[PDB]
């Protein structure tokens, strides 16, 4: 009857399942090996990746021009999964280091940049390469 | 000049 | 679809968020600290909880009768939010235990069971101790 | 019994800002 009430179930059941190498289905799969892939990311290259996000002020005015700016350099040489987990782990750091910093505002145009990016120049080499069906049988954990 | 270097150098664990 | 490449960014953004006490939004919030708290009664609860539900032995016959019995006794002498989280950790486990038997098929009757129940016996009580946005205030883990 | 015995015991640990 309420959206929100079977919303929370399913978001709660979802987490249970991937805690014991389940999925709720073939999307929840997709984003668990994606959040995993980002922490593996993130624990992997901190160094480095701390050096790059550290470099970055972020402000209304050129967030735009920074993202564009990272992104491109990230898929100069074309696109790996690798580049793909990466530009999603970017994409959080500034979302976090946005409200650090009292833009809440840019969470939600991050947000819709990054599937902008995705739609437009990702999901050709997205599927040519197997979709993230692929991507899951690659890097996911999960019991299948 | 960096997010290209670490483009080609980031490796993920993988499923062999 | 361009929808799926949405959700997908909105998932990762709202974890990688949530890693740094941050939340995407009120539901993301609520959602997160239902998580930690079905965490944190799995860990406190183990052994009578795992005791129970060892003898719950699910067929897909016998599936409903033991989630309506099991959730009619553990509100018996009504509603508490310790109560609620046992409810949805519940549930969690027959569906765990549901797909380790292959019985994948009572997952999404498990939720409809569970959203159907929260929605009728458990959101009256509580709207009246103050909604999801107290049971964050009290169990969820969040910045200031 | 076991269900309702456990219902009655549950105790998580709370943001007590006090």
């Not at chain 1, 090996?33 to 290259?45: I, K, M, S, V």
């Not at chain 1, 972020?58 to 790996?80: C, H, K, M, W």
């Not at chain 1, 959080?92 to 739609?119: F, H, P």
């Amino acid at each position: 009857m309420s959206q929100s009430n079977r919303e929370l179930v399913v978001d709660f059941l979802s987490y249970k399942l991937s805690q014991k190498g389940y999925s709720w289905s073939q999307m929840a799969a997709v984003k668990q090996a994606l959040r995993e892939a980002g922490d593996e990311f993130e624990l992997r290259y901190r160094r480095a990746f701390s050096d790059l996000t550290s470099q970055l002020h972020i402000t209304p005015g050129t967030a735009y021009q920074s993202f564009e700016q990272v992104v491109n350099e990230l898929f100069r040489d074309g696109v790996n999964w690798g580049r793909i987990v990466a530009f999603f782990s970017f994409g959080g750091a500034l979302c976090v280091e946005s409200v650090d910093k009292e833009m809440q505002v840019l969470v939600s145009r991050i947000a819709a940049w990054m599937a902008t990016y995705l739609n437009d120049h990702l999901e050709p080499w997205i599927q040519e390469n197997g979709g993230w069906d692929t991507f899951v049988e690659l890097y996911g954990n999960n019991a299948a | 000049k960096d997010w290209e270097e670490l483009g080609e150098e980031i490796r993920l664990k993988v499923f062999v």
